[PDB]
Enzyme design. Structure first.
Site: not given
Ligand code: HEM
Ligand SMILES: Cc1cc(N)nc(COc2cccc(OCCCN)c2)c1
Ligand code: HEM
Ligand SMILES: Cc1cc(N)nc(COc2cccc(OCCCN)c2)c1
Ligand SMILES: C[C@H](O)[C@H](O)[C@H]1CNc2nc(N)[nH]c(=O)c2N1
Ligand SMILES: C[C@H](O)[C@H](O)[C@H]1CNc2nc(N)[nH]c(=O)c2N1
Ligand SMILES: [Zn+2]
Lengths: 407, 411
Positions: B108, B111, B280, B285
């Site tokens: 993420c 963070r 958000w 994305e």
């Molecule tokens: C606040 C705005 C946030 C932004 C801009 C953001 C940004 C991102 C982005 C760009 C990704 C990669 C997404 C992808 O390629 O699929 C990501 C992954 C992730 N974020 Fe965030 N994030 C945010 C909030 C959060 C929140 C609130 C949580 C949980 C409380 C979180 C937990 C995660 C987790 C666990 C992943 C890994 C997801 C996966 O393995 O599919 N993030 N974040």
């Molecule tokens: C909370 C949050 C904010 C943000 N800007 N982006 C995310 C995206 O995280 C994910 C969550 C689920 C799957 C994922 O990637 C694999 C696609 C499979 N559906 C990526 C999550």
């Protein structure tokens, strides 16, 4: 034990068995992944020789043969007596091509079997080194129709008589600290330029001064040689639609030639092994031109394009980056100097990976380096799972000589 | 032990000691790096050490380590585990736990925001209908008419693995995908399999290009149930471009709320299999992945056509040019509608400041480079040049098997 890699765009799954042959370590453990870190006697040598010769005799379909045993015996005898051994020409060529084949950070490996190998093991002085290198440069350049080549100087003996090319690439631009506080030329090369000046080089002090070679033979003090200017092919950088682009005064050299690595074959170490291919456009346009610590030209281009540079979210950096990269490819193509774009190179690598899995059971690849520095996910390598592991023969990093050398 | 990371653009070197607290495996060994692999019912015996590790971290964070309150809580939890085989988290611990799972999420980039997370405690939920109400409230709170607020909703923990709460949707808001008999896809090709499950379960598919999928919700290991999110709660943004007036006629739009619902939250050995969380979007994305992946909406050709780029050879960089234009459009649209969004330059810059702060105050920041670096313009963002260390800290978010593969149907 048998590991699967999946491509997430095409659902294609491949099985890797080749990794079980890996010898060197990765930097990672079960507790920590170091995937994004840039730089992570007789007794030892016969095992390494046997491992290599075993793979070599295997490759020519002669494993367990008379000639196979006879060579193992011969090399064993030689190490016992001399503490080292000499590669046969055939072994040296096979070894060099395989070091390239095993280079997990190289996207261009579809080409691995077409490598011209220049055996410079008869070289004894720095003047000879200079002669071999000019010949390599001219051969590889081939008036713009680039051919892959490596030149291999004598192998490490006791480590006190190393051959080294002190330069990081055969062809690179000088860098100078200014009394102005800024930097003139390539900021990555300031330190090496100073060493050159200190060794006597008369620096022109321009933006694009081709560095002299600093060559070390037989562990002697390194000496200076200027590559004949007529052998260094350069390309003026212009844009197919922006008439003003040429007024930036940019140019780049056609030949990418890495000179600071070490080639390990069957336990033997070749500390001077300059090698060259042709550029992928992003290497020049994204990295050389746009890195903050490099030529850093993004602001100038964006201004001439009259983009809104007020806020990052207008994506003015992104727009200027694409245009610089278009100009690099167009300029090389117009002057007929071989170049590959990141779309074509990564498509080729995916085909190569599939070939290697099908024919060898695997392909070590380092995703962090294979994925291009722009437009990552619109290239197929982005979606391709890769396993990174170290096979030998290999190219390895080695300490810069000015830290190691005793004058 | 100390580990150093270098930034190759600034020459700044950081020292990690936090990795010493890492527990779970990475997948890598000294012989193989698995850093680009996407996917690398307990005993009381394992449970108490995990609870104790968590409670020690929690009590240290409040500067009460070794206090009477800390010891009494250890005792109280120990007794609960031996008598009931599990234990319940205090509200305070749950909040701390969910925040830290986000803080620890190495993939993420967002963070910097980790301490501002609204935690909705849904542990009193018992039915799928109850779940739907909780999720609607989350969606409305998080959306906040475009001024998005991060939130997580936490349903009851796993007991024996036969009574799991699950949201079958991978994200709370997503568009349907339909495979046509001629092999073409209408809508989002990523969601075909799931769309088919929904239809099978009785959903009446409108069969358009942007149909918001219904929620499929499982309470207490029961068969999942279908619910439509009130459309008035689903904020969407029509995509248009600031200079190209034909862009709107592509007919594109996207939803504003990114809400992951298929992950498992582990806190102190407890497993929360239904824990939807939202933030958000970062623009890429939607503009890079959602719009431009070959296996997604795949609009690059149509865009470059309308821009009249030279499409005869890849080396004109037509795909790259169209890609930037589409991403400009997404950011422009969201900003114009006052829906929170961040660009990849801003996000990665903020991430580097966050990472440096974590190194100084916490001793590290595990980060997965492969995921942190944006999918366009990688090397002109500061994360590209940043060495990172990837390791696993708990509390954490983990993947789990898709429930359609594991569920025992009741009928
Ligand atoms: C606040 C705005 C946030 C932004 C801009 C953001 C940004 C991102 C982005 C760009 C990704 C990669 C997404 C992808 O390629 O699929 C990501 C992954 C992730 N974020 Fe965030 N994030 C945010 C909030 C959060 C929140 C609130 C949580 C949980 C409380 C979180 C937990 C995660 C987790 C666990 C992943 C890994 C997801 C996966 O393995 O599919 N993030 N974040
Ligand atoms: C909370 C949050 C904010 C943000 N800007 N982006 C995310 C995206 O995280 C994910 C969550 C689920 C799957 C994922 O990637 C694999 C696609 C499979 N559906 C990526 C999550
Ligand atoms: C023929 C065209 C070739 C192309 C297009 C190509 C492409 C590339 C690229 C883009 C990189 C990453 C470079 C960087 O980002 O700095 C690379 C790394 C590398 N390539 Fe090639 N390559 C070519 C030929 C060769 C040859 C001929 C060899 C050796 C015989 C070689 C061995 C390597 C090695 C060892 C690396 C990694 C070096 C390092 O870690 O710094 N490549 N290649
Ligand atoms: C042979 C060749 C062809 C081509 N198109 N590009 C390359 C560049 O490979 C290298 C080789 C050595 C160093 C390097 O830069 C990063 C390493 C800095 N420590 C990059 C090499
Ligand atoms: C920190 C990170 O390892 C470093 O910036 C890497 C990332 N990927 C790269 N990829 C290539 N091809 N070349 C590079 O120099 C780098 N640099
Ligand atoms: C194979 C590879 O790991 C896979 O395509 C990854 C690469 N990096 C990513 N980065 C982010 N943020 N999201 C992703 O889905 C992926 N996919
Ligand atoms: Zn690793």
């Amino acid at each position: 034990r048998f590991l699967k890699v999946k491509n997430w765009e095409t659902d294609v799954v491949l099985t890797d068995t080749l990794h079980l042959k890996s010898t060197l370590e990765t930097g990672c453990t079960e507790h920590i992944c170091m995937g994004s870190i840039m730089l992570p006697t007789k007794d030892q040598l016969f095992p390494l020789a046997k491992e290599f010769l075993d793979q070599y005799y295997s490759s020519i379909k002669r494993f367990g043969s008379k000639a196979h045993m006879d060579r193992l015996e011969e090399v064993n005898k030689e190490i016992e007596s001399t503490s080292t051994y000499q590669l046969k020409d055939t072994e040296l060529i096979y070894g060099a091509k395989h070091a390239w084949r095993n280079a997990s950070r190289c996207v261009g490996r579809i080409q691995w079997s077409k490598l011209q190998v220049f055996d410079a093991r008869d070289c004894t002085t720095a003047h000879g080194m200079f002669n071999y290198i000019c010949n390599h440069v001219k051969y590889a350049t081939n008036k713009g129709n680039l051919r892959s080549a490596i030149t291999i100087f004598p192998q490490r003996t006791d480590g006190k008589h190393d051959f080294r090319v002190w330069n990081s690439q055969l062809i690179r631009y000088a860098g100078y600290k200014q009394p102005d506080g800024s930097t003139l030329g390539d900021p990555a090369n300031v330190q090496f330029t100073e060493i050159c000046i200190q060794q006597g080089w008369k620096a022109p002090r321009g933006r694009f001064d081709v560095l002299p070679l600093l060559l070390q033979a037989n562990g002697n003090d390194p000496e200076l040689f200027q590559i004949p200017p007529e052998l260094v092919l350069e390309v003026p950088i212009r844009h197919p639609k922006f008439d003003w682009f040429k007024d930036l005064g940019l140019k780049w050299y056609g030949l990418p030639a890495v000179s600071n690595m070490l080639l390990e074959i069957g336990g033997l170490e070749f500390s001077a092994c300059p090698f060259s291919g042709w550029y992928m456009g992003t290497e020049i346009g994204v990295r050389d031109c746009c890195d903050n610590s490099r030529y850093n030209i993004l602001e100038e281009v964006a201004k001439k394009m009259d983009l809104d540079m007020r806020k990052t979210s207008s994506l003015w950096k992104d727009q200027a980056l694409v245009e610089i990269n278009i100009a690099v490819l167009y300029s090389f193509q117009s002057d007929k100097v071989t170049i590959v774009d990141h779309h074509s190179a990564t498509e080729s690598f995916i085909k190569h990976m599939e070939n290697e899995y099908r024919c060898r059971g695997g392909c070590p690849a380092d995703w962090v380096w294979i994925v291009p520095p722009m437009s990552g996910s619109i290239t197929p390598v982005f979606h391709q799972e890769m396993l990174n592991y170290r096979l030998t023969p290999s190219f390895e990093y080695q300490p810069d000589p000015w830290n190691t050398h005793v004058w």
